[PDB]
């Protein structure tokens, strides 16, 4: 009914780690780790490493950007960083071992895959969230048409919410669920970019993909 | 050269099996440093604090309906399952012991005091070693190292007999073990 | 009431060392453990891997949370440090020795904590390394640890070996001898 990042998810389990509030490393914390890779022979891999940490961050927030309406999104998000923390343990004591940094990079990749799997699993187990999410897409598509030739001056960030209030501001879900309403508001900024001719849109997010995919 | 204080956290999930997998008990425990703080006993069905420091955790975890259901079921989804996954090479693994007998002095100022029966490389640890002097079992003079686990899935043990052999006597070390249907024997002509 | 077998999943995390361990045990012997650095399952006996498997990723998840909990508890206990408990070292052979007949020395390090120790094999004063192996830190019902170090060797009439164990609970390094006695 709803597309999952991983079609037939493997059972995931929670460690009740959703209430942690400082799992994400600050720029200094990361820099301090990067400085351990001081030797010249490790300069090339260190680049690949930094790029991966960045990709990692982008992936985690990507998950919270599309599924902040799924109670379990915090579990997944936090687990991601708790694992990163452990990898850094090795990184910290093998800071100039190129093969080890290569492995760490490979692991961060697996951590991300695991995130996608578990994410898909928890979504598969929450029928109601699936229905609401699908609905958000349904309406955004309607809105894609409805706003066909209207002026969309979204410069002061006020028109988007107003449009959503006009068209659907009355729908139980738009009034009660901030994440849902936000999905639609996010939607018009996407619609606008679509009208202007942006073609990268589907790669923007699972939501964007679902909306502009046929 | 590192005087820094250390902090240790251990977690253990124990699956106790009785008569195959007929009766099963799961014991989950949290140990801070060298002291258990909280535990889940499948015989209880919910977390119980062992020390005061563990109360917050029992209270929090026990309020998690979905979690307790998982644990209560684990007896099947975890314990019974993993027992099966490995039965072949664990419950079933059998390795025949190698038996040898050689003399030794109880003191470097004594004659040729005791006979040592060396039983090594076997598995499981369950085993029996007896000493016979001309068909007559000997017991009052036996001393052993006790069972020894080598840490690589094999055991060993030395069973010694305190007896000064005299010409004509024939001692025998008999070893009974699950890997062999008929007792192993090694003789030693005095 | 007759207990036949025990399968234990044991894991731990230690500070400030930042070292963790995840492993499965059967009746006292290690079935397998997950090398944290490489993040991969390693079987105590290679045959085991040809009949079973384990998603190392799982270990990573568990240790990750373990690490978080250590932070929590240390703080909650008001930073109470673990009390060093020195090991009992014993060294014996795999089987009876015969000149030039391959054998193996086993150094048993037992009843200690924390799980940090430095071991060194010595043949006539020189540290030996080729061929030596060791187990990870094995659990004990009293929550202390067990560890085994192995040294394959060719018996001779002119060699004395000793296992040197260093631990925070010890005053000076402990040194166990072996010269066929």
């Amino acid at each position: 009914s709803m597309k999952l990042r991983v079609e037939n998810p493997k059972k995931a389990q929670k460690h009740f780690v959703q209430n942690l509030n400082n799992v994400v490393f600050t720029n200094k914390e990361l820099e301090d780790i990067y400085n351990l890779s001081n030797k010249e022979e490790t300069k090339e891999v260190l680049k690949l490493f930094k790029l991966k940490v960045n990709q990692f961050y982008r992936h985690a927030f990507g998950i919270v950007n599309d599924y902040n309406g799924l109670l379990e999104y915090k579990e997944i998000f936090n687990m991601m960083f708790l694992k990163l923390s452990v990898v850094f343990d090795t990184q910290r004591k093998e800071a100039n071992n190129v093969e080890q940094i290569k492995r760490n990079i490979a692991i961060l990749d697996e951590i991300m895959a695991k995130a996608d799997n578990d994410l898909s699993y928890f979504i598969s187990q929450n029928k109601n969230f699936q229905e609401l999410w699908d609905k958000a897409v349904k309406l955004t598509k309607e809105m894609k048409i409805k706003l066909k030739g209207q002026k969309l001056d979204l410069r002061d960030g006020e028109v988007a919410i107003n449009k959503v209030r006009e068209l659907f501001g009355s729908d139980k879900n738009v009034k009660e669920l901030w994440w849902f309403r936000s999905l639609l508001v996010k939607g018009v900024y996407l619609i606008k970019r679509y009208y202007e001719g942006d073609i990268e849109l589907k790669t923007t997010s699972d939501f964007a993909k679902a909306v502009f995919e046929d | 050269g590192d005087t820094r204080p250390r902090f240790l956290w251990q977690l253990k999930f124990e699956c106790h099996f009785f008569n195959g997998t007929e009766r099963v008990r799961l014991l989950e425990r949290c140990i801070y440093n060298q002291e258990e703080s909280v535990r889940f006993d499948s015989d209880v069905g919910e977390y119980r604090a062992v020390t005061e420091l563990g109360r917050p955790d029992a209270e929090y975890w026990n309020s998690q309906k979905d979690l307790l259901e998982q644990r209560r079921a684990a007896v099947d989804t975890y314990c019974r399952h993993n027992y099966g996954v490995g039965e072949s090479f664990t419950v079933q693994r059998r390795v025949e012991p190698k038996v040898t007998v050689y003399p030794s002095k109880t003191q470097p100022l004594q004659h040729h005091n005791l006979l040592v029966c060396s039983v090594s490389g076997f598995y499981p640890g369950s085993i029996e070693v007896r000493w016979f002097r001309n068909g007559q079992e000997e017991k009052a003079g036996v001393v052993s190292t006790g069972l020894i686990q080598n840490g690589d899935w094999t055991f060993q043990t030395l069973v010694m007999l305190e007896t000064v052999p005299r010409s004509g006597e024939v001692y025998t070390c008999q070893v009974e073990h699950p890997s062999v249907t008929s007792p192993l024997t090694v003789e030693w002509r005095a | 009431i007759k207990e036949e077998h025990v399968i234990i999943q044991a894991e731990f995390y230690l500070n400030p060392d930042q070292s963790g361990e995840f492993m499965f045990d059967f009746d006292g012997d290690e079935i397998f453990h997950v090398d944290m650095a490489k993040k991969e399952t390693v079987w105590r006996l290679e045959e085991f891997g040809r009949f079973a498997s384990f998603e190392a990723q799982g270990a990573l998840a568990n240790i990750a949370v373990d690490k978080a909990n250590l932070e929590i508890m240390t703080k909650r206990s008001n930073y109470t440090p673990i009390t060093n408990v020195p090991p009992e070292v014993t060294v014996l052979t795999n089987s009876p020795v015969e000149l030039r007949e391959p054998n193996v020395l086993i150094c048993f390090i037992d009843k200690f904590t924390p799980p940090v120790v430095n071991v060194t094999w010595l043949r006539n004063g020189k540290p030996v390394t080729t061929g030596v192996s060791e187990t990870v830190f094995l659990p004990r019902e009293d929550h202390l640890f067990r560890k085994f170090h192995y040294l394959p060797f060719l018996p001779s009439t002119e060699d004395v070996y000793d296992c040197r164990v260093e631990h925070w609970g010890l005053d000076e390094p402990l040194l166990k001898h072996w010269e066929f006695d």
């Binding site: 389990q13 460690h15 009740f16 | 977690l11 996954v85 490995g86 | 499965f24 079973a52 373990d66």
Partner: peptide, 13 residues
């Protein structure tokens, strides 16, 4: 055959 494990839980608060 696959060895399944028990998930670790995050301590109170």
């Amino acid at each position: 055959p696959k060895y399944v494990k028990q998930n670790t839980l995050k301590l109170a608060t």
